[PDB]
Design an enzyme around this catalytic site. Structure first.
Site: not given
Ligand code: SF4
Ligand code: NA
Length: 214
Positions: A121, A139
């Site tokens: 991420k 996320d």
DNA sequence: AAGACGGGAC
DNA sequence: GCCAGCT
């Protein structure tokens, strides 16, 4: 699950509520972005900006971070939370930039992940925001939004969500899309209390309808 | 592979 | 007294 056309619909709708959606982490260069995101894990962007405001004045290069004792750096980012591992990570992270990345920030997503505190991420946010490399960083806000709207299965891995979205959105709009979703979720389809009642997507959103009844 | 890490909005 | 991603 929604049809591709409906997910395209949904995204387009999000692109109308948040035309100027962007990364909210305040930064001036790839190095500052990288530290910012690392400091982000399980923390609000707002708070990160609050701290880096001063932090980025005291430290401006990888050499500045590894010059102080762990303790000091820990107190510099005490407000953030998870400051112990983060402080250790940053220092080691900076050492690597120097030892293996010619003192700069690597532009390769997989390379970034070699850095402590930098997961997929985080690596995606960096290549995309700092380096323009199309990528969808999944996320909390992207995962939730995707799951409530039915973009994917309520049980898919963030990776599966990422791959799902990649299959849909054109490579050219991954970054911007990702940003609109964050906004859509951070400011509208909020975890605590989503604004379903006035949500332009309630009509095809199983989660909204479900919430409306209850 | 669950657990450990550690200001703000209700 | 839930919310913001390495071993
Ligand atoms: S309906 Fe509610 S749960 Fe569904 S996207 Fe809109 S705000 Fe989120
Ligand atoms: Na890493």
């Amino acid at each position: 699950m929604l049809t591709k056309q409906q997910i395209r619909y949904c995204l387009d709708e999000m692109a109308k509520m948040f035309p100027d959606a962007h990364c909210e982490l305040v930064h001036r260069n790839p190095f500052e972005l990288l530290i910012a995101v690392v400091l982000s894990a399980q923390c609000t962007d707002a708070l990160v900006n609050k701290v880096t405001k001063r932090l980025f004045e005291k430290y401006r290069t990888p050499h500045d971070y590894i010059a102080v004792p762990l303790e000091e750096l820990e107190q510099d980012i005490r407000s953030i939370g998870l400051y112990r591992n983060k402080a250790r990570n940053i220092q080691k992270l900076c050492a690597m930039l120097i030892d293996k990345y010619n003192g700069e920030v690597p532009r390769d997503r997989d390379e970034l992940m070699k850095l402590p505190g930098v997961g997929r991420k985080t690596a995606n946010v960096v290549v995309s925001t700092a380096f323009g490399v199309p990528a969808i960083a999944v996320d909390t806000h992207v995962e939730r939004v995707s799951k409530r709207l039915g973009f994917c299965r309520w049980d898919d891995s963030v990776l599966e969500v990422e791959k799902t979205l990649m299959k849909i959105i054109p490579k050219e709009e991954w970054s911007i899309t990702h940003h609109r979703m964050i906004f859509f979720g951070r400011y509208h389809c909020k975890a605590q209390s989503p604004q379903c009642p006035s949500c332009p997507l309630l009509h095809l959103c199983r989660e909204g309808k479900k919430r409306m009844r209850k």
